[PDB]
Amino acid sequence: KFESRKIMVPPHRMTPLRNSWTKIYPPLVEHLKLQVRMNLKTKSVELRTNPKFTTDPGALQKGADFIKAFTLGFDLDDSIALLRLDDLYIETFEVKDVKTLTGDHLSRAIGRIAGKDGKTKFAIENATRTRIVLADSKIHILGGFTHIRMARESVVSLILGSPPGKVYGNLRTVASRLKER
Amino acid sequence: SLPATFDLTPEDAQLLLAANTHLGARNVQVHQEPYVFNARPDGVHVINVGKTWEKLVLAARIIAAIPNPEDVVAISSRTFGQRAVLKFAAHTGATPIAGRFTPGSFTNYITRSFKEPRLVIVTDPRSDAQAIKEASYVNIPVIALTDLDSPSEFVDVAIPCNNRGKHSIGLIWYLLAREVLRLRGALVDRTQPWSIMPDLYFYRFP
Amino acid sequence: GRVRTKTVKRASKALIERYYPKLTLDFQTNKRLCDEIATIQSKRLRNKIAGYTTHLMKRIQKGPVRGISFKLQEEERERKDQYVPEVSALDLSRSNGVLNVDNQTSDLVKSLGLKLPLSVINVSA
Amino acid sequence: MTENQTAHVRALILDATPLITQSYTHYQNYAQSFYTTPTVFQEIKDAQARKNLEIWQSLGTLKLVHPSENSIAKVSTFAKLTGDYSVLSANDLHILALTYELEIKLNNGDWRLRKKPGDALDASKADVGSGEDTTGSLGVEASEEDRHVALNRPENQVALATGDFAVQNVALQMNLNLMNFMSGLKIKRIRNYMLRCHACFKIFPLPKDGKPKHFCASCGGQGTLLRCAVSVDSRTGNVTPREDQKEYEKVIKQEEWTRRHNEKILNNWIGG
Amino acid sequence: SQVFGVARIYASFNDTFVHVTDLSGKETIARVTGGMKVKADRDESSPYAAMLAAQDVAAKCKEVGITAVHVKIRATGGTRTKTPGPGGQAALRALARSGLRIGRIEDVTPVPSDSTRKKGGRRGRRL
Numbered sequence: 001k002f003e004s005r006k007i008m009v010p011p012h013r014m015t016p017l018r019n020s021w022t023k024i025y026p027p028l029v030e031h032l033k034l035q036v037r038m039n040l041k042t043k044s045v046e047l048r049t050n051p052k053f054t055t056d057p058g059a060l061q062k063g064a065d066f067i068k069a070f071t072l073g074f075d076l077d078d079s080i081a082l083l084r085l086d087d088l089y090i091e092t093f094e095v096k097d098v099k100t101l102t103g104d105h106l107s108r109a110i111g112r113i114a115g116k117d118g119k120t121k122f123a124i125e126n127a128t129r130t131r132i133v134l135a136d137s138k139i140h141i142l143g144g145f146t147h148i149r150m151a152r153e154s155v156v157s158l159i160l161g162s163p164p165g166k167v168y169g170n171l172r173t174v175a176s177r178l179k180e181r
Numbered sequence: 182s183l184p185a186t187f188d189l190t191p192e193d194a195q196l197l198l199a200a201n202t203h204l205g206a207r208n209v210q211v212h213q214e215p216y217v218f219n220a221r222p223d224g225v226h227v228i229n230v231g232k233t234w235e236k237l238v239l240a241a242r243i244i245a246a247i248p249n250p251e252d253v254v255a256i257s258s259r260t261f262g263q264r265a266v267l268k269f270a271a272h273t274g275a276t277p278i279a280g281r282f283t284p285g286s287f288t289n290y291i292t293r294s295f296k297e298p299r300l301v302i303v304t305d306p307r308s309d310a311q312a313i314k315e316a317s318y319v320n321i322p323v324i325a326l327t328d329l330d331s332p333s334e335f336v337d338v339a340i341p342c343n344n345r346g347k348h349s350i351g352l353i354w355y356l357l358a359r360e361v362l363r364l365r366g367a368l369v370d371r372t373q374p375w376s377i378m379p380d381l382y383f384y385r386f387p
Numbered sequence: 388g389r390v391r392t393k394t395v396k397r398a399s400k401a402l403i404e405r406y407y408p409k410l411t412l413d414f415q416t417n418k419r420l421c422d423e424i425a426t427i428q429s430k431r432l433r434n435k436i437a438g439y440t441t442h443l444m445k446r447i448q449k450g451p452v453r454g455i456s457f458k459l460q461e462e463e464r465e466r467k468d469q470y471v472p473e474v475s476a477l478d479l480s481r482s483n484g485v486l487n488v489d490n491q492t493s494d495l496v497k498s499l500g501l502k503l504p505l506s507v508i509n510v511s512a
Numbered sequence: 513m514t515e516n517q518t519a520h521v522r523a524l525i526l527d528a529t530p531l532i533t534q535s536y537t538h539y540q541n542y543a544q545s546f547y548t549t550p551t552v553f554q555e556i557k558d559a560q561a562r563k564n565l566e567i568w569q570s571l572g573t574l575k576l577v578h579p580s581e582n583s584i585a586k587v588s589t590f591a592k593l594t595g596d597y598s599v600l601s602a603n604d605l606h607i608l609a610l611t612y613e614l615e616i617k618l619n620n621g622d623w624r625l626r627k628k629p630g631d632a633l634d635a636s637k638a639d640v641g642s643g644e645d646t647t648g649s650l651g652v653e654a655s656e657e658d659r660h661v662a663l664n665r666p667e668n669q670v671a672l673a674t675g676d677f678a679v680q681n682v683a684l685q686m687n688l689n690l691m692n693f694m695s696g697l698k699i700k701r702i703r704n705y706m707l708r709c710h711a712c713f714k715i716f717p718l719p720k721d722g723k724p725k726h727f728c729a730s731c732g733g734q735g736t737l738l739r740c741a742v743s744v745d746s747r748t749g750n751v752t753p754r755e756d757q758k759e760y761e762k763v764i765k766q767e768e769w770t771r772r773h774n775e776k777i778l779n780n781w782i783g784g
Numbered sequence: 785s786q787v788f789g790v791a792r793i794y795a796s797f798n799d800t801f802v803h804v805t806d807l808s809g810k811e812t813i814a815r816v817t818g819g820m821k822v823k824a825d826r827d828e829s830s831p832y833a834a835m836l837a838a839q840d841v842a843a844k845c846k847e848v849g850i851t852a853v854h855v856k857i858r859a860t861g862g863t864r865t866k867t868p869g870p871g872g873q874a875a876l877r878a879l880a881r882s883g884l885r886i887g888r889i890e891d892v893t894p895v896p897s898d899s900t901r902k903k904g905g906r907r908g909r910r911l
Contacts, residue, residue, distance in 0.1 A: 005889065023778060031782070061880035064889075065873070080781045089831070089870035097865055099908040145831065145870070156910035191501045195486065198503075199477035201731065203492055204711045219491055223512060225711050225733075227491050231499050259756035267467070281758075308757060345732025345754055346712070348476070380475040381468060487713060 001051045005064045009043040010071055023076060028066065031083070032059050065090070072140050073133035087144040095137045098159050109159050110134065120164050124154055127175035150174040186371050189234050193356070196379070197234075200348035203227045205341075208330040216341040217329065226329055228341050237353070239338045240302075240324045241360035247300050250274045254298040256282060256312045261347040261384040262304035265354040268382045269302075272358050278312070287315040300324070302357075305344045306332050326353060351382035391439060395432065398425070399439040403447070404455040412448070414441040479504070517541035518659040521671045521691070522618060525611045526574070528552050528603075529675030530693035532561045536568045542696040543671065544663075546574040547614060549606050579609035586627075587612060587682075594629050594685045599678045599720045608682055611672045615688065618669035629685045630749055641666065644680075645701035645743075646692060668698075677704045678717060681751070684744045701745050708740035708753065709733065715742065715751065727755040788887050789813070789845060789853035791879070795872035796860060799828045802841045802875055804853065814844035818871070831874035838875045842882035854887040855879070861894035863902035868893075 009017065017024075025036055033054045037046035047063050066079050069090055082088055095101060095109055114134060115121055121132045130151045133140040139159075141151045153174070158167050197203070207224045209217055216233075217226045244253055253275045255266035263279040270277035276296055278286075283294035301316050303309045303325040313335050316323055327339040340357075343349035359375040362368055368375060403410065406424060410417055417437045427433040446452070451459065474480060485504045488496075493505050524543035531548070539546065546568070553576060556565055568574045587609040591597035597605075616622050623637035654662060662668050671691045672683050680702050683690050690699035707716040712731035719725065728736045732754055743752045754760075790809070794801035799818035805811060816837040818828040827833055845853065857868045857876070868891075880886060903909065 003886070023774065027778070027782060057883055058877060058881035061877050065877075077777070080777075083781070084784075087831070089873050091870060092867045093865060097902075098910055099904075100906070148870075153911060156908075160908045160910070189499065189501060191503055194496070194499075194501050195479070195503055196477055198486055198488060198492060198496075201712050203495070204731070204733070206733075218495060221489055221491055221510065223510075223710060227489075227495065230495065258758075259754070261756065264467070343732070345727070346730055348730070352477070378471060378475065379477065380472055383475075385470055 002049055003060060004046055004048040005060065007045050007047070007064060007067050008071065009045060011043075013070070013073070014040075014043075017070075020076065024070070024079075027080075027083070028063060032056075032063065034060070034063050069142070072138075073135065074131070074140070074142070078131050078142055082142075088142055089144070089148075091139075091141050091148065093139050093155075095139075095159060098156055099161070106137070109161070110136075112158050112161070112164065113139065113155065115164065120158070120167065123168060123171060124151065127171055128154070128178070146178070150178065183238070187238060189231055192374075193234070194230065196352065197230050200343075200352045201346055202233065202343050202349040202353065203230055205329040205343060206345075210330065210333055212333040213327070213329055213341065228329070233341050233353075236338065236340050237357055237360060240340055241357060241364050243300060243322065243324055243338060244273075244302075244357070244361045245364045249299075251276060252298055253300045253302065254278065254296060256301060256303045256309050258282065258309050259304050259344065259350070260386075261350050264384045265304070265351050265382050266302075269354050269358050272377075273361060275302075282309065282312050284311060284315070287312070287319050287321070302326075303336075304350065306336055306339075326350070347384045351384065352379050355379040355382045391435065395435045395439050398427075398436050399443055400454060402436070402440055403443050407456060407458070410440055410444050412441065412444050414438055417441050417444075516656075518656060518663070519544040520659060520662055520668055521689075522663060522669050523547055523614055524671045524673050524691065525607055525614065527607060527674035527676070527679075527693075528556060528561075530673040531556070531564065531568075532558060533675075533693055535564055536571055536573065538694075539673075540573070542691070547577050547610065548574055549603060549610060550576045550578060551603050551606065555603065577610055579606045580613050583609040583613045583616070587686075590627075590629075590686060591682055594682060596678045596682050596685075596717060599717050600676070600682065604674075604676055604679045604682075607672070607674065608679060608686070608688075611670060611683070611688060612686065615670040619666040624666060624687065626685070626687050626749060633687060638666070642692075643677075643703040644690075644692065644699050645703065646695065646697045646699055648700050649697040671698075677702070680704075681717070681744055684746050685749060687746060687749060690746070699746065701743055703741060703743045705739050706742040706751075706753070707737045710736045710738055712736070715740075715753065786852045786885060787850050789850045791853050791855035793855065793857040793868065793872045793875050794860075795857065795868035795870075795875075797829065797869060800834050800837065800869075800871035800875060802834075802838045802879075804841060804845065806850075813848060813850070814841040816841055829869070829871050831871060834871040834874040835878040835881075838878035839882060842879060842884050845884060852885040852887050853879070856890050856892035858891065858893040862896060863899050866893055866895065867891070 028034055029036065033056070035046075035048040035050060035053070037048065038044075039046065045067055047060065047067065049060055062082070066082060069079060069082060072090065072092070074090075095106060099109075101109055113121070121134070124130060125132050128151050129143055129147045131142045139155060141148050141155070143151070154167055154171055157170065158164065205217075205226050205228055207226075209226060216228050218229050220226045247253055251274055253273070254277075255269055255275050256278050257263050257266040258280060266275075266277045267279060269275060276298075283292065285292055286294045286296065287298075289295060297319065298316075298321055301312065301321055301323045303312060303323055306313050306325050306327060310332065313323060313325075317335050322338075323336055324338045325336040325340070326342050326344055327333060327336060328344050329341070331339075331344075333339065340353065342353045355377075356379075359368075362375070363371065402421065402425065410420060414437060417440050418434065421427065421433055421437045421440065425433070425436070427436060443452075479485075485506045487508055488505045489510055490507055493507050496503050496505060519542055521543040523545040524539065524547070526539065526546060526548050530539070531552075536546075553565065553574075556562060584605065587605050588597060591600055591605065591608075600608075612625065615625060621637060623634040626633060667689065671689045672679075673691050673693055674680065674683075675693060680690055680699070681704065684699075684702060690702070691697065692699065705718055707718065707725065707728075708714070709728050709731040711733050712728065714728065714730045716729055716737075725737050727734065731737075734754075740753050744750070745752070788807075789804050790807055791804040792801065794803070801818075802816050803812065803814070805813045818830075818833050818837065821837045821840070822828070822830060822833040845851075855876070857872045859865045859868050876889070
């Protein structure tokens with residue numbers, strides 16, 4: 001009653017894969033009780049199960065979700081939060097899907113979601129229980145629906161070109177009645 | 182303006198090629214192009230070691246030209262450099278600066294690290310660049326050990342060597358020490374080798 | 388927090404950089420030790436200094452601390468010269484008397500005009 | 513009907529890798545006496561390895577022997593001469609010292625051991641009586657009397673069973689007998705990767721932590737270190753193929769503190 | 785050995801569809817919406833509604849007897865987004881959690897070569 005899933009390894013993250021793989025595999029192999037095989041040539045990771053493992057069918061989907069998380073820039077502490085919780089999910093979205101921007105407009109939108117020393121990114125991870133990774137044209141937010149929904153409202157404020165001060169004011173407003181309840 | 186005995190003795194040339202001083206960096210500045218002879222074709226240049234010998238002969242003449250031997254100051258912050266300058270300061274009586282050179286030491290007479298030199302030797306002009314620029318304020322000649330990609334500004338009589346390896350820096354400090362003691366008069370015979378071996382200046386990490 | 392004052396700390400630093408060996412792990416001997424060596428005006432302050440020297444005797448016996456001790460500083464005065472090798476790496480016998488030199492530096496040797504035991508080695512890329 | 517495979521080695525020094533990979537039955541047909549260090553046995557933490565260690569302790573064939581301090585000093589001097597002391601552990605040095613003491617006791621002298629690397633062996637005292645090239649030990653159909661004569665030879669008195677390439681290079685520098693953990697044949701040559709300076713041509717071993725050296729130890733050239741395969745012959749003993757900134761030490765200490773904090777966070781995640 | 789189904793997950797911002805039939809799209813077997821499982825209009829696309837809806841689809845597939853299933857997931861595609869929303873991810877978690885065998889997981893989202901104009905205008909569409 002085996003089951004194997006196939007997943008793709010990005011080239012931009014295979015060097016931290018071989019850097020921190022020693023911290024990646026033994027928590028899931030010990031606590032979550034799975035089997036991992038590499039294919040370093042064909043950018044593939046084999047996540048396999050066995051009847052000699054524990055019967056837990058949903059943690060195979062969870063393990064494919066950990067490697068899908070690690071596909072898109074995500075560190076290992078968010079993998080610990082994905083180990084412990086279940087309400088935390090993943091999202092991608094595009095810069096062009098809100099507003100048609102080109103070139104330096106795209107660069108200034110990436111600068112607006114990034115900010116000076118990543119401070120508006122810091123303000124959006126700490127006040128919303130979200131975690132932020134910026135790609136070239138992809139935005140990535142983890143978490144639950146009440147958390148990521150106000151993260152949606154903030155990021156479509158910010159990528160529309162609203163100033164970050166109004167983002168901070170609306171951010172602490174939604175954080176205020178977030179921690180109020 | 183020098184006698185013919187002063188040139189490259191072949192055991193010193195064997196000593197120079199033993200310490201890999203002729204190997205250098207990959208970038209060649211506009212200023213230090215005559216020190217390179219040609220390039221071994223990976224990206225490593227080889228330097229004219231006769232220029233290094235005669236250039237340190239100049240630096241030895243600068244050090245011997247001062248009247249007070251305690252007024253020359255050696256500067257170091259590289260890990261090999263502290264041992265090299267403490268041996269040089271032990272053997273010629275110079276004032277060493279080991280480790281962190283204190284800012285405001287060449288101006289600002291208040292600080293107890295205020296020494297005014299008339300002559301300054303520096304291990305490299307990039308990591309010890311602050312002693313270079315503070316000596317640029319109170320009119321001090323600086324003779325220095327520059328690589329092939331060292332900053333060449335604010336130095337005069339700069340000795341091309343290798344500051345990367347401990348062999349070359351310990352040897353080149355040893356040769357400056359033996360050149361100035363053979364020029365001052367502490368070792369009368371030019372034929373006689375100096376009694377201390379160059380491996381005293383060499384760094385070991387236990 | 389019971390952070391001790393700087394006078395007790397500095398007096399203990401001076402009395403341990405200078406008067407190391409007769410101080411020990413016993414506070415009661417250290418009390419009349421700092422009575423017999425130091426002129427401290429009060430019983431309370433000399434108790435502070437004697438207890439602090441007792442505590443620095445407690446952690447000095449496990450290893451070295453950043454401050455000055457004599458019995459190490461003779462040792463880095465022969466660390467400067469005790470490990471001189473009888474044969475260095477710059478001597479001839481470590482390469483059997485003939486150097487490992489490329490073609491260009493042998494051209495430097497034959498162009499400058501010196502005679503030297505060189506072995507030409509061919510290197511590429 | 514299995515043949516009576518006689519032991520070709522009187523005593524074999526077993527590492528944690530051969531104790532974990534192979535059972536006592538795999539090493540029973542090759543060696544007569546089993547010797548090991550107590551720290552290597554205390555370092556074993558796997559459950560199947562603990563069961564195999566309990567089975568070996570019930571068998572009683574394994575001898576827990578600590579090496580002598582003078583042999584430890586000689587092994588440390590040999591490792592400092594060969595430059596392998598930075599990568600070798602203290603347990604590896606103790607295992608090499610115990611192997612040297614067992615070879616000194618078994619052969620009644622140190623004529624078969626080289627004090628320095630590249631020194632010729634004293635052959636005048638012999639008449640007084642995975643990248644490993646193990647070729648030449650195959651095709652030997654020795655009889656029982658031939659196996660007894662080979663076990664009576666001083667070359668097969670002591671063997672070192674280990675998986676550490678630095679320890680294998682130290683034993684090849686000491687001209688010690690090396691045996692495969694799975695095959696049991698005597699190692700003749702070993703091929704390993706070593707860091708070579710591209711300018712100074714200085715040879716250094718691979719790092720234990722796996723981090724690449726940004727500056728060479730002797731050359732100092734940025735990127736001058738290259739991965740070079742080196743072969744070591746047991747008969748000859750010849751291996752055939754900046755950092756001075758305080759900010760660099762601060763970066764190394766920050767990387768070590770980050771690794772320690774990550775290990776603490778991983779331990780809290782495992783134990784939470 | 786077993787029988788594989790052909791599954792579709794359609795993940796908008798405001799609902800989810802878990803919709804499965806046999807091979808080649810012959811006749812639809814199970815059919816749920818986000819609106820039928822939670823009557824609250826704020827929770828049409830909730831992961832709770834997604835998992836309960838996919839659990840009812842799994843119950844339908846178990847009573848018709850299909851054990852293996854092949855799934856493709858999609859967004860709306862076109863001028864709107866490309867990767868599915870988290871309701872699809874919770875649907876995947878539910879169908880794997882249900883004990884039903886899974887065959888293949890891919891992303892058949894209808895991707896344009898070159899799209900037309902979206903429904904926002906020049907300025908933007910979201911808030």
